[PDB]
């Protein structure tokens, strides 16, 4: 019983129109939009009750609008995106019209507004096989996944073992590092580890895969450069079990 | 109009207790909300504080409310790594809109058992030269610092939990596109224990 | 003219104070047109349906723990709080009365005239207005209009005395009100 | 013994709403529905106290919704019109040339909709004309005050014309110097 938000992430050019979608909790009476610029506080934008705007922010009203398409969906529209509009957009809902209850938040939509779409680059993904020295010393095996040269930030790295996503024995960096820190639009790097028992890695019937979900250019954007279009894609790398 | 949280960041060892504060306006008070916001997850509602001097408990987490002075305290008892999150407080006036504080980013340092500090070299499944150096099995007191050299990239310490094998371990990754680069010099900027295993 | 049917949703949130703030009785009342259908009385602790129309709201609002908790705490968080906000300009509001004594008609003596004692623009409503023949309290033949709200935080009272005057008559109006320390008097001569 | 009343309503098809605070029969403040701001009965109250108009605005939206729910529940039963009682009096005893205020008191009526016009020598007057909102009553009927600052003269005749759906024809309450 939770608030749903689509898409998870969005990348658009400055001056373009964005439509953020939300599925509030079915029986809830109040709907809200909140936003958080990275490094800033969670800020109120707008509240909605009985087909009308209750409260609105100073950030809202100017080229900002909300819509109720049906009795299930709620949307936020930014007519002309600005660089300052780059934030995590949260949709919220509360059951009571009286307001003496908790506000349920959506997963959020990470919106990145860029001046130029040429800065956008997909990641390069590589899997690094566990050291045999580690197997001989601890009887454990750790694989390392490296996602490099991506712009913009906020990718989704996941490990897949024998066709199923794993979380146990996995640890990914909570923040990516800058390849060229002396740059405004620097390409990012991210790492992750998957630790298994040596017996599990030695089995050649076991398959290991590292997935990186990248969010870039849309299927209605301007791409005039030589290199491939940096669209929303899944860049992958793999490794099979080795006895050795 | 304005809400403030103290401290901005907080580090606590597994099993030890902590607390942090939230300051809100004393005028036109209706409610004070607490949210737990874990990294990849959405903010989860913890408490709704309305009554002065009333204390609510949600497992090992406790919250106090003082309306006249305009302060709220959140208590975490026997901190678990699962408690690592950004804890946000929000003030509600006569309407519905929430005024948020800056939050208290809580990091629970886990209990590292059976340490075996070592630096290993990992080769690419596609090849070549660009290999990774993994500093693993060190204790929570050992800290990993920045690279200092632009051509070398070092990631911060990260804890993995082998849930089925009830084991936790620390790790940091180092990589570079250099012929000279080796795992022996890779973690120079940080204080590595003398007992660190460098394989032959 | 406009003969269209009308539909009214009316609500009152009442705070009744006794012995200052020592006793507070809170009532949250809901009305559809002229009919009361549901109410929350702080003496009962929950919502109760007044008519059969208020039954869905009774069971629904009592099931909503956050809304019910808000009502059970209203005596202190709402009632006692708002009393304190107003107190100085509300409970402590004091306006001295303007007392004017005049005859209703310019009729000659030995006949009849109504002596009017006008007490206007005062606050609070607590007032005691008395008529005196010369120095003796005249209880019979006193026509009062009672307490009148002016709707601008002031009151007024018109207390009249049935008079049959003769040569040397001195009628006096005595007014005692919480705003005045000494009860102010106004004398009238034939 | 004191009474603090929060009075609120919403009426259809008129689309008229109201939110006000009352202390012992007197209005503390009301919220202007069009301007969306707190309107204190006496200007000084705005210095001694504060109020968030949004709390009132959120309640009006709920009453608007509840009116729809209640009409449908009652099988679309309308209000019975209760005609008002009209009284005209002065602020203080009347004296020629000496400034005074004519008070038109409208009482014991429902629904809370009334058309009030001041008539001096049969002509409508608007100069300095102030009015209160619909005030609450113990029997759940309404009260209303209308004011007219005036210069008392033997030349002028005054009237308070009151229009209500419970009246057969517009009610006129006469006042003249005597």
């Amino acid at each position: 019983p939770e608030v749903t938000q689509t898409p998870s992430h969005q990348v658009t050019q400055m001056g373009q129109e964005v439509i953020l979608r939300c599925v509030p909790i079915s029986n809830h009476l109040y709907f809200y939009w909140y936003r958080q610029i990275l490094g800033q506080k969670v800020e109120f934008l707008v509240s909605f009750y009985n087909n009308e705007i209750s409260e609105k922010s100073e950030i809202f009203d100017d080229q900002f609008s909300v819509e109720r398409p049906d009795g299930s969906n709620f949307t936020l529209k930014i007519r002309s995106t600005k660089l300052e509009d780059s934030a995590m957009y949260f949709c919220a809902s509360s059951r009571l019209a009286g307001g003496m209850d908790e506000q349920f938040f959506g997963p959020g939509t990470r919106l990145t507004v860029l001046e130029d779409l040429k800065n956008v680059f997909p990641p390069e993904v590589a899997v690094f096989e566990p050291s045999e020295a580690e197997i001989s010393h601890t009887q454990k095996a750790t694989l390392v996944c490296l996602a490099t040269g991506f712009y913009p930030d906020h990718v989704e790295l996941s490990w897949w073992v024998n066709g199923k996503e794993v979380h146990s024995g996995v640890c990914t960096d909570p923040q990516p590092l800058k390849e060229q820190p002396a740059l405004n639009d620097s390409r990012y790097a991210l790492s992750s580890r998957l630790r298994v028992s040596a017996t599990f890695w030695q089995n050649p019937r076991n398959h290991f895969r590292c997935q990186v979900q990248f969010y870039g250019l849309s299927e209605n954007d301007e791409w005039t450069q030589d290199r491939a279009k940096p669209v929303t894609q899944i860049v992958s790398a793999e490794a099979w079990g080795r006895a050795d | 109009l304005n809400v403030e949280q103290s401290p901005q960041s907080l580090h606590v060892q597994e099993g030890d207790s902590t607390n942090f504060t939230c300051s809100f306006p004393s005028s036109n008070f209706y409610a004070l909300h607490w949210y737990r916001w874990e990294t990849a997850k959405s903010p989860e509602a913890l408490f709704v504080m309305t009554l002065n001097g009333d204390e609510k408990k949600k497992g090992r987490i406790s919250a106090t409310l003082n309306t006249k002075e305009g302060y709220s305290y959140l208590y975490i008892k026997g901190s678990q790594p699962e408690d690592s999150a950004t804890y946000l407080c929000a003030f509600k006036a006569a309407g519905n809109k929430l005024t948020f504080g800056g939050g208290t980013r809580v990091l629970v340092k886990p209990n590292i058992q059976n340490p075996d500090p070592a630096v290993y070299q990992l080769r690419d499944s596609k090849s070549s030269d660009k290999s990774v150096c993994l500093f693993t099995d060190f204790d929570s007191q050992t800290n990993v610092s920045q690279s200092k050299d632009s051509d070398v990239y070092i990631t911060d310490k990260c804890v993995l939990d082998m849930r089925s094998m009830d084991f936790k371990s620390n790790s940091a990754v180092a990589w570079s596109n250099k012929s000279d680069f080796a795992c022996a010099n890779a973690f120079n900027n940080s204080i590595i224990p003398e007992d660190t295993f460098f394989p032959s | 003219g406009d003969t269209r049917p009308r539909f009214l949703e009316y609500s009152t949130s009442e705070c009744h104070f006794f012995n200052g703030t020592e006793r507070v009785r809170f009532l949250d009342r809901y009305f559809y047109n002229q009919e009361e259908y549901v109410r929350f009385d702080s003496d009962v602790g929950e919502f109760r349906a007044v008519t059969e129309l208020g039954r869905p709201d009774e069971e629904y609002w009592n099931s909503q723990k956050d809304f019910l908790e808000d009502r059970r705490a209203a005596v202190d968080t709402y009632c006692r709080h708002n009393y304190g906000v107003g107190e100085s300009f509300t409970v402590q509001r004091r306006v001295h009365p303007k007392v004017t004594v005049y005859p209703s008609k310019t009729q000659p003596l030995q006949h009849h005239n109504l002596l009017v004692c006008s007490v206007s623009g005062f606050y609070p409503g607590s007032i005691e207005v008395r008529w005196f023949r010369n120095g003796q309290e005249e209880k019979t033949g006193v026509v009062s209009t009672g307490l009148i709200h002016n709707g601008d935080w002031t009151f007024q009272t018109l207390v009249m005395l049935e008079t049959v005057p003769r040569s040397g008559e001195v009628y006096t109006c005595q007014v005692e009100h919480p705003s005045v320390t000494s009860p102010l008097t106004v004398e009238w001569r034939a | 013994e004191h009474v603090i009343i929060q009075a609120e309503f919403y009426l259809n098809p008129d689309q008229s709403g109201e939110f006000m605070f009352d202390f012992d029969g007197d209005e503390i403040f009301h919220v202007d529905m069009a301007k969306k701001e707190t309107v204190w009965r006496l200007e000084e109250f705005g210095r001694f106290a504060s109020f968030e108009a949004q709390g009132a605005l959120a309640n009006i939206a709920v009453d608007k919704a509840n009116l729809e729910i209640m009409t449908k529940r009652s099988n679309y039963t309308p209000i019975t019109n209760v005609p008002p009682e009209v009284t005209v009096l002065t602020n203080s005893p009347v004296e020629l040339r000496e400034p005074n205020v004519l008070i038109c008191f409208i009482d014991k009526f429902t629904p809370p909709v009334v058309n009030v016009t001041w008539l001096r020598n049969g002509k409508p007057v608007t100069t300095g004309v102030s009015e209160t909102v619909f005030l609450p009553r113990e029997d759940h009927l309404f009260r209303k005050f209308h004011y007219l600052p005036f210069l008392p003269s033997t030349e002028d005749v005054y009237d308070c014309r009151v229009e209500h759906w419970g009246l057969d024809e517009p009610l006129l309450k006469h006042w003249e110097f005597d």
Partner: peptide, 13 residues
């Protein structure tokens, strides 16, 4: 100091 509105809840549909 502020006067506090007693917040109203939506009726049972």
């Amino acid at each position: 100091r502020f006067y506090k509105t007693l917040r109203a809840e939506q009726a049972s549909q």
